[PDB]
Amino acid sequence: DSSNEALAGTFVIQTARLGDDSKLSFIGDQNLINALSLATIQEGENSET
Amino acid sequence: SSDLDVVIKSAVAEGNYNLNVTVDPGKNFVYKSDVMTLNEDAIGAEIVTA
Numbered sequence: 001d002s003s004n005e006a007l008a009g010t011f012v013i014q015t016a017r018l019g020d021d022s023k024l025s026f027i028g029d030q031n032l033i034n035a036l037s038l039a040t041i042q043e044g045e046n047s048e049t
Numbered sequence: 050s051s052d053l054d055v056v057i058k059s060a061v062a063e064g065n066y067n068l069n070v071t072v073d074p075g076k077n078f079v080y081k082s083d084v085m086t087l088n089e090d091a092i093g094a095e096i097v098t099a
Contacts (some may be wrong), residue, residue: 006063006065039063
C-alpha cells in the first residue's frame with residue numbers, strides 16, 4: 001500500500017542511472033505494443049556538480 | 050474486476066484510480082398464475098394435515 005506497487009498484477013520497470021540518460025524506448029509491432037500499453041509514473045531529473 | 054465496463058467519450062487524463070462502493074438494495078418482480086381445476090371425471094389424491 002501507498003507505494004509504487006499499490007496495484008496488483010502489473011509490471012514495474014526501472015533503470016539504475018540518473019537523468020536524461022535513463023530514458024527507455026520501446027519499438028515493435030503495433031498490436032503487441034498496444035497490448036502492453038506502457039505508461040510513465042516517475043520522471044528523472046538532473047544532478048548538480 | 051470482471052464486472053466493470055468503461056465507455057469513452059472525450060480526452061482522458063491519466064492514472065490509476067481506486068474505487069469504493071456502498072450499496073442500498075431495492076425490490077424484485079413477483080408473478081402469480083391463475084387457478085387450475087379438474088375435469089368432470091378425474092380423481093386425485095394427496096396427504097393433508099388436520
